[PDB]
Amino acid sequence: AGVRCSLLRLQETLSAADRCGAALAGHQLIRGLGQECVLSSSPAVLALQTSLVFSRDFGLLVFVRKSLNSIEFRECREEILKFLC
């Protein structure tokens, strides 16, 4: 499972100085992450993917609410809602 190494880099894009350019890494990184855990079929790796998507210090909803003052991150915040759907 790559899901945690993927999510760890998503928080880096939010903290990067080039906010305009870093959005392009973050979008395509969510676009990869949201293929990995829809594809899955094993109950105890589905445990990993239900555990770390909805993480508290880390994970997808923290990234939305912490990025929510930006206008650059629209592409991420659409994709991450499409994925959560």
From Swiss-Prot:
Serine/threonine-protein kinase that acts as a molecular sensor for DNA damage. Involved in DNA non-homologous end joining (NHEJ) required for double-strand break (DSB) repair and V(D)J recombination. Must be bound to DNA to express its catalytic properties. Promotes processing of hairpin DNA structures in V(D)J recombination by activation of the hairpin endonuclease artemis (DCLRE1C). Recruited by XRCC5 and XRCC6 to DNA ends and is required to (1) protect and align broken ends of DNA, thereby preventing their degradation, (2) and sequester the DSB for repair by NHEJ. It is found in: Nucleus; Nucleus, Nucleolus; Cytoplasm, Cytosol. The chain holds residues 6 to 90 of 4128 of the full protein. DNA-PK is a heterotrimer of PRKDC and the Ku dimer (composed of XRCC6/Ku70 and XRCC5/Ku86). Formation of this complex may be promoted by interaction with ILF3. Component of the core long-range non-homologous end joining (NHEJ) complex (also named DNA-PK complex) composed of PRKDC, LIG4, XRCC4, XRCC6/Ku70, XRCC5/Ku86 and NHEJ1/XLF. Additional component of the NHEJ complex includes PAXX. Following autophosphorylation, PRKDC dissociates from DNA. Interacts with DNA-PKcs-interacting protein (KIP) with the region upstream the kinase domain. Autophosphorylated at two clusters, the T2609 cluster and the S2056 cluster. Autophosphorylation induces a conformational change that leads to remodeling of the DNA-PK complex, requisite for efficient end processing and DNA repair. S-nitrosylated by GAPDH. It is linked to Immunodeficiency 26 with or without neurologic abnormalities: A form of severe combined immunodeficiency characterized by reduced or absent T and B cells, recurrent candidiasis, and lower respiratory tract infections. Some patients show dysmorphic features, severe growth failure, microcephaly, seizures, and impaired neurological functions. This is DNA-dependent protein kinase catalytic subunit. Belongs to the PI3/PI4-kinase family.
